[PDB]
């Protein structure tokens, strides 16, 4: 019927209306929104958002560290079968190696075969950018005109091997010994300066090789841009879907099956894709929060008492800010729940607890590749789950404040309509 009876049954609603009528309670909630936004998009260790982004990226990097060494790759620049091409990528987690060797000849690159070199180059560039970033520390979510320098090398040897030909990079026909080219390259809509150089090395007592050096100067390190790289990593793997043959250590957890095609890891890859997607959705709330900042104070006008039915045109914004913070918080938690081994089973669980959330280096800093990186995650997946959790627990008051602010504002928007 009427309101008295309704508030006799739901007193927290009565308290909500009292607050919605009181400019200083509204202003307090608007302050709280300012502070919790800063916790989410300005802080690092304390932000559930930051940790979720970090987990999503770490899970992709770690997937590759676990299986990269076992992944076949080979052939020439045209994506076809090579007779005798050995193409080696540095600072990658190979079998007892800090490089990965792509020398599978005669077999035809493609699905359930060796990954083509073109595809490995895409995967490698992404892995180097992520690893450089993780080593340096991810910035806060609000900070998105940061940049980093990334530099990586690879080599080509064997007759017929076209994967370091100068024309691939725009270098003079020859060229290949000492030649260099500097060129822009677009990465996530930003302009990066890129220097690619070539040398020929003739070691005294064995085969000649070509070395290519890529220097990326000004790669963006924003959350949005790095999650695009993690997406490129895990999708390149899933789409090229190459053949793999793993090597188990006797004793300790074991990988099944021992061979097949990488896209066969369907849960692992789906989970990492979901995590990235959720992290991207979450990072997209950043703009909504900034646009609807709550730092201006509110009241009546002309020194007249505050009227919740006419003076609350700010409420739509206040509601959108708070809804957006709460969406961040929930996607963050969702990211963690996709990968957290407490709720996994079968072969997926044993992949995460047995491989992804372990590391065989030696805790060495993030982004470090060693001769023992292979067949382990070495991306701080366990610590990142733990820290996401700790941050969420320390977000208890703020989460309540955000819900109270969303409710105050919803109440005023209601009064406001009519």
């Amino acid at each position: 019927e009427n309101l008295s009876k309704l508030l006799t049954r739901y007193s927290t609603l009565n308290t909500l209306i009292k607050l919605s009528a009181d400019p200083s309670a509204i202003n307090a909630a608007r302050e709280n929104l300012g502070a919790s936004a800063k916790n989410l998009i300005g802080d690092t260790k304390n932000s559930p958002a930051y940790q979720a982004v970090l987990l999503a990226i770490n899970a992709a990097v770690g997937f590759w560290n676990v299986l990269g060494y076992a992944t076949q790759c080979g052939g020439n620049a045209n994506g076809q079968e090579s007779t005798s091409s050995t193409t080696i990528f540095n600072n990658e987690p190979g079998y007892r190696s800090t490089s990965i060797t792509c020398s599978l000849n005669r077999y035809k690159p493609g699905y359930y075969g060796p990954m083509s070199i073109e595809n490995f180059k895409k995967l490698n560039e992404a892995y180097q950018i992520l690893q450089t970033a993780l080593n340096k520390g991810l910035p806060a979510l609000k900070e998105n005109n940061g940049t980093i320098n990334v530099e990586y090398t690879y080599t080509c040897s064997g007759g017929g091997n076209t994967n370091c030909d100068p024309s691939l990079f725009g270098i003079g026909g020859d060229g290949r010994n000492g030649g260099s080219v500097t060129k822009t390259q677009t990465i996530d809509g930003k302009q990066v300066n890129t220097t690619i150089s070539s040398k020929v090395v003739q070691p005294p007592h064995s085969a000649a090789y070509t070395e290519i050096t890529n220097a990326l100067n000004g790669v963006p390190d924003s959350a949005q841009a790095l999650l695009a790289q993690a997406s490129t990593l895990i999708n390149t793997i899933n789409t090229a879907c190459p053949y793999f043959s793993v090597t188990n250590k006797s004793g300790g957890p074991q990988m099944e099956p021992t061979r097949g095609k990488l896209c066969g890891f369907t849960e692992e890859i789906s989970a990492i894709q979901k995590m990235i997607t959720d992290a991207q959705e979450l990072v997209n709330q950043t703009s909504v929060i900034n646009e609807h900042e709550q730092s201006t104070p509110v009241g009546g006008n002309n020194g007249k008492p505050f009227n919740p039915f006419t003076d609350a045109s700010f409420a739509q914004g206040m509601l959108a800010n708070a809804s957006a913070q709460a969406k961040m918080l929930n996607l963050a938690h969702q990211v963690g729940q996709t990968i957290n081994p407490d709720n996994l089973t079968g072969t997926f669980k044993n992949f995460v607890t047995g491989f992804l959330a372990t590391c065989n280096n030696k805790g060495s800093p993030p982004g470090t590749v060693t001769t023992q990186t292979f067949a382990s995650g070495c991306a701080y997946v366990e610590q990142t789950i733990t820290n996401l959790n700790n941050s969420i627990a320390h977000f208890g008051t703020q989460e309540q404040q955000i819900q109270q602010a969303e409710n105050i504002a919803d109440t005023l928007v209601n009064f406001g309509s009519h």
């Epitope: 918080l329 938690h333 729940q337 959790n389 969420i392 627990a393 819900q403």
Partner: nanobody, 113 residues
Framework: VQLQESGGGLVQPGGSLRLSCAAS????????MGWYRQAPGKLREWVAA???????NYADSVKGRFTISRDNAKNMLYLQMSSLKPEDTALYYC????????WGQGTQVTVSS
């Protein structure tokens, strides 16, 4: 997808109480859990929380008086309250963090002489 609190009651100031929360596995397993309360005239207030690995943290108003704990084998959350005051009178609720959006009935705690 369910939450249920018990162990509240009327006590004397100085008194003490142990609350329990039975949570479903989908809510509890792998999730930060926590306690909350709703005092007369006020909105729900966060009180404490604890990570799956059992690390607790508390609001300033209860730090050093209350202790939250969890038993991961029975999907149970506990809150142990000492040196209770009349300020601590409220309906107490449990949930994960972040919150599942349907709350339990709560358990009433009243403190008075």
């Amino acid at each position: 997808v369910q939450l249920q609190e018990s162990g509240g009651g009327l006590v004397q100031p100085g008194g003490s109480l142990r609350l329990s929360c039975a949570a479903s596995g989908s809510i509890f397993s792998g999730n930060v859990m926590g306690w909350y309360r709703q005092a007369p005239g006020k909105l729900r207030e966060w009180v404490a929380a604890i990570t799956p690995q059992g690390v607790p943290n508390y609001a300033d108003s209860v730090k050093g008086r209350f202790t939250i704990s969890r038993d991961n084998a029975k999907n149970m959350l506990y809150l142990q309250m000492s040196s209770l005051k009349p300020e601590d009178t409220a309906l107490y609720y449990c949930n994960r963090l972040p919150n599942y959006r349907s709350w339990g009935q709560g358990t009433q705690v009243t403190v008075s002489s």
